[PDB]
Assembly symmetry: C2
Homo-oligomer: 468 residues x 2
């Protein structure tokens, strides 16, 4: 009965790792992970934003089914559906020691008794940030302007209980917790770790070591003001790209610390490791005041975080399982976050519930070097109103064809991705019969999603996002 | 109960799609621009200079006439076979200097008419240039690659279809930057008179298609993808279905431009004209970034120093571009100015610097920058005005922007305010103040509508029998 470790990076772009082609950043640990496992070049997140993507991946269900369509606003009634089951829920029922450390972002806050929390979601141990980003209260509530100091996480909960201000930056705070929990394991029970790193989401916080690696990529202003709090960046000169790269290398190091602990404890050959990201990056294209001075890369792919174009949804993914998988295999088979649930059911020898719809397919055939026969197209969504450039709402991927649907059920884009990698040759009005086939397939999938039985069972309905 | 019953020479060097962040002297952390960095070191560098528009043709029309480009009949792109061109009665800096007795010449990108064959439209000669080697198009074509039968196609781009004094040329034996710089150098050699000169050197770099010699590609080998290294001369017409090339080819093209600017500047100095030549180096609009919107925009890497938007956009990154002026030792050397200035300012600035008078029969939008160069404060009597008429875009573009002090308002294509920013507190345009600043909103929208009416009812436009024509072509 194999252990499972799912390592989730935050806003990590498709081109943000050396093994995915980044020409500057040093990511030795994740690069080695890819060499020892299977790396996917055509893997997608279920959504181009944190909350629906994470909900999708943990449930095996298109996020709209689970009640999460985009951001989760403070004080409102948006959370993961009460009757939803996560990988953790199912593995607990198989007799697993379950734990999560880091970003949760599946409810409106840790103090909400009317909403599922980490334990309800199947994690028997948790060090959790319920929010979408790291806060340091000592920087937020500081009186002077400008504010100087590196960001140290406040407001996290260990097993539902308040914690002191961290004495490590977020990545180390997460990884030390993971290593400690593994150090203090009671028995020989199989474990499931969900290591949800907050890197590379704003606010970036990196130790000097990683910062020094990219001093060429810092602006003169950054060098004069390296500790400048991001809350004070709106009216300041550009910082360059080095702080972003530093943060990537810091993440890499903390991933390495988790992987080194698995190997040291004698569990390499018994542990399934999945490394992925929840959505495409924040690039140089900042849309919000909390998005400044970042430098995510998409390997040329169109769009970024928020967007249903490739660079918003295509993300790194690597799977390793001791010596049981082909080492250093690279797969270009189209796969996505919703596939993990059936994959792990098969790999870990548990049955999926049959009282609910799952959207994904087992990837075991891909790992076994066989064809993947996919019955359904890949389906993506985001419900993000009030954007300066209006977002689209749905995307469907079927073979080489990809259709993007606007916030009014109208096809806005149609691409053949094999002849148009960068989504610059819109085929709407040019391919009438492919248009009708793809639109028909969209309506059938949308209808199935909107009429989801499990969502009906909890007295819920698809609710359009009306909030910001 | 209620119900009871010796005149100075002029060289204007215009780069194409060169971004605000694209030069080392503007903070680029990778690219080597020794010649342009030196120009800034020897001159006045503006950090808050704007092009008149976020697209080639209206920007260039604006700069050359001192008039907001819509007044001149150019609102965005110039398609072939249509009637979009610089208005017939418009005068450029070249027309004015021709009448002062200048030897006037133009080399490189024109992009102010629908083609060199169009006898119904003003050409380079009509615009006041007595000598020209011109590309009338918005981009370089190499017919040999365009017409090649094999797919994919391999070969570096050599300019075809350029006109020397109205006449066809053979395919260039040098890539565009060198084709231009060589023409400039030869013209400066072959001239006989001691008449003052005006050179408009309109480089095609860094516009797609990129074309750079091996020397410059080698400078950036680290920044080339594995695929690029295996397929270095792959033709850009065949990039749509191929792996990313990395960012090295873009940097190479920047350094190539820099060397060609250097060649021209070296010639000015070598012929003994450094002390008596005004040199303006600028760009026509913001860059094409990693944010590709079109099949001809792939594998590019323009930088905006973090500023919002890019080419096409009215946000800072689409209109703020590099600008350097040098005039021998007549100007403060190594000066850096953060006074907001723009392309429409050049006409009255040069009128003062070069001692000619502006025509009194037409509206001009800019103001003389002589006070800035004399290290005094500049007071504007008009807002800075920008526009672009670009329909059918995937993310709809906005149409106007006005700038007054630290305040910037962007107007959508339905004539409605969409954004209001204080650039002093919000460099990155992320804090929209629409519905948060009632007095400022009223002041700025009022200033806009006044400026819009004045532009729409331009007298010179009326004099040639024209009107503002909304862009309905693609
Ligand atoms: Na995220
Ligand atoms: Na955009
Ligand atoms: Na241009």
């Amino acid at each position: 009965q194999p252990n499972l470790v799912i390592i989730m990076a935050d806003d990590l772009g498709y081109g943000d790792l050396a093994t995915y082609g980044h020409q500057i950043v040093k990511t030795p640990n994740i690069d080695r992970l890819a060499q020892e496992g299977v790396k996917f070049t055509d893997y997608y997140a279920p959504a181009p934003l944190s909350s629906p993507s994470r909900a999708g991946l943990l449930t095996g269900r298109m996020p709209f089914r689970t009640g999460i369509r985009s951001w989760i606003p403070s004080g409102k009634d948006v959370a993961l559906g009460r009757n939803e089951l996560t990988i953790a829920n199912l593995l607990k029922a198989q007799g697993y020691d379950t734990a999560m450390m880091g970003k949760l972002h599946l409810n409106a806050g840790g103090d909400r008794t009317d909403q599922p929390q980490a334990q309800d979601m199947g994690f028997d141990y948790s060090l959790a940030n319920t929010a979408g980003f790291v806060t340091d209260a000592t920087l937020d509530n500081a009186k002077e302007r400008p504010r100087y100091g590196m960001v140290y996480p406040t407001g996290w909960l260990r097993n539902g209980q308040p914690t002191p201000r961290a004495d490590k930056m977020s990545g180390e705070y997460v990884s030390s917790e993971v290593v400690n929990w593994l150090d203090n394991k009671k028995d020989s029970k199989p474990f499931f770790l969900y290591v949800a790193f907050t890197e590379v989401h704003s606010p970036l916080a990196s130790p000097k070591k990683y910062l020094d690696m990219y001093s060429q990529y810092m602006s003169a202003y950054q060098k004069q003001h390296p500790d400048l709090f991001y809350g004070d960046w709106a009216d300041k000169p550009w910082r360059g790209v080095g702080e972003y790269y530093a943060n990537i290398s810091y993440l890499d190091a903390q991933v390495g610390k988790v992987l080194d602990k698995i190997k040291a404890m004698g569990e390499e050959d018994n542990t399934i490791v999945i490394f992925t990201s929840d959505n495409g990056p924040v690039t140089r294209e900042a849309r919000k005041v909390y998005e400044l001075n970042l430098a995510g890369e998409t390997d040329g792919l169109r769009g970024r975080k928020d967007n249903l174009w490739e660079g918003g949804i295509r993300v790194p993914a690597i799977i390793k399982y001791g010596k049981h998988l082909p080492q250093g295999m690279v797969s270009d088979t189209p796969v996505y976050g919703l596939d993990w649930m059936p994959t792990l059911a098969k790999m870990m020898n548990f049955k999926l519930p049959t009282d609910r719809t799952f959207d994904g397919e087992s990837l075991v055939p891909v790992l076994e070097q066989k064809a993947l026969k996919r019955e359904k197209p890949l389906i993506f969504g985001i419900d993000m109103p009030f954007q300066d450039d209006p977002t689209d709402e749905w995307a469907i991927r079927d073979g080489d064809w990809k259709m993007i649907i606007d916030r009014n059920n109208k096809p806005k884009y149609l691409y053949n991705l094999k002849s148009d990698r960068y989504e610059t040759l819109n085929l709407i009005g040019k391919k009438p019969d492919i248009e009708k086939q793809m639109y028909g397939k969209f309506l059938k999938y949308k209808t199935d999603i909107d009429n989801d039985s499990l969502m009906k069972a909890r007295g819920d309905k698809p609710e359009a996002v009306t909030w910001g």
